[PDB]
């Protein structure tokens, strides 16, 4: 009820409140909008970056926790080639429900097939799409509530230390300021083994992203601020990349995207 003037749920605090992600984040619209253009170009670039990290570089191990998975599984497709077990997490219940629809292969679930086929092509067509989605489904062990602003982001859910914490397009959305952002990155560290990987992909200098006409706050960090927060949260950056490709103005006012792979100090 600020009617676009300001992101939804931000009128008082200046950033979209977390209760907004339980109310107004509609996973189906979210999926319809970004994951069915500038949006598909970004998706391609994320997919190729994830392929490279997990399949070409040595980002490998036993357990990966995906932080702020949303209703989406495209971030996990190359990861399952490299990680025995995957935990997907998100603050929004409706997102977790959408994920569980997908995991059970409910007919009512979102069709990921063309994104799955694209990952298969990237991976050299060793298998086709249906075989790949099913390897991913069996790799996904847990679907949990996450709050990255909490020092136990997963609460009392016991999990062994992870080899990788992944987070795509989430931290910008979740963190109203840079102290919270740095704190969230430290929080995610609590889940990682000594020297575990941390993989973040997110938008640069983006202050909102739309779901159709629903406006959500994003933390408008540049490259230097991202680098600073990662370092202070107790990590050594292995590689950091920035692309200039942006979403359409009608989805986000971002100036490019970043991806990084860091290790816990
Ligand atoms: N405090 C918080 N802790 C964990 N997740 C949060 C959060 N606040 C917002 N989120 C989540 O962050 C996600 C941002 S949209 C990104 C979703 C998906 N990873 C993708 O790549 O497209 C949403 O799923 C939203 O529910």
UniProtKB/Swiss-Prot annotation:
GO terms for cellular component: cytosol. The keyword S-adenosyl-L-methionine applies. Keywords: Acetylation, Citrullination, Cytoplasm, Methyltransferase, S-adenosyl-L-methionine, Transferase. Its main location: cytoplasm. The modification Citrulline is found at residues 28, 137, 186. One of its GO terms (molecular function) is nicotinamide N-methyltransferase activity. Deiminated by PADI1 and PADI2. Its EC number is 2.1.1.1. It comes from the Eukaryota. Pathway: Cofactor metabolism; Amino-acid degradation. S-adenosyl-L-methionine binds at residues 30, 35, 68, 74, 90, 95, 147-148, 168. Monomer. Belongs to the class I-like SAM-binding methyltransferase superfamily. NNMT/PNMT/TEMT family. This is Nicotinamide N-methyltransferase. The lineage of its organism: Eukaryota, Metazoa, Chordata, Craniata, Vertebrata.
């Amino acid at each position: 009820h600020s009617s676009g003037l300001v992101p939804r749920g931000s009128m008082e605090s200046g950033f979209t409140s977390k209760d907004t992600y339980l109310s107004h984040f509609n996973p189906r619209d979210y999926l319809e909008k970004y994951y069915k253009s500038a949006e598909s170009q970004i998706l391609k670039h994320l997919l190729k970056n994830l392929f490279k990290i997990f399949c070409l570089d040595g980002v490998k191990g036993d357990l990966l926790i995906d932080i702020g998975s949303g209703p989406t599984i495209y971030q996990l497709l190359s990861a399952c080639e490299s990680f025995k077990e995957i935990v997907v997490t998100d603050y929004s219940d409706q997102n977790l429900q959408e994920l569980e629809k997908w995991l059970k292969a409910a007919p009512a679930a979102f069709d990921w097939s063309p994104v799955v086929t694209y990952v298969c092509d990237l991976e050299g067509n060793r298998v086709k799409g249906p075989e790949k989605e099913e390897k991913l489904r069996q790799a996904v062990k847990q679907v949990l509530k996450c709050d990255v602003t909490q020092s136990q982001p997963l609460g009392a859910v016991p999990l062994p230390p992870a080899d990788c914490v992944l987070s795509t397009l989430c931290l910008d959305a979740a963190c109203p300021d840079l102290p919270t952002y740095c704190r969230a990155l430290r929080n995610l560290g609590s889940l990682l083994k000594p020297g575990g990987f941390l993989v973040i992909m997110d938008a640069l200098k983006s202050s909102y992203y739309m779901i159709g006409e629903q406006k959500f706050s994003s933390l408008p960090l540049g490259r230097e601020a991202v680098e600073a927060a990662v370092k202070e949260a107790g990590y050594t950056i292995e590689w950091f990349e920035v692309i200039s490709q942006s979403y359409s103005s009608t989805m986000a006012n971002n100036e490019g995207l970043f991806s990084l792979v860091a290790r816990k100090l």
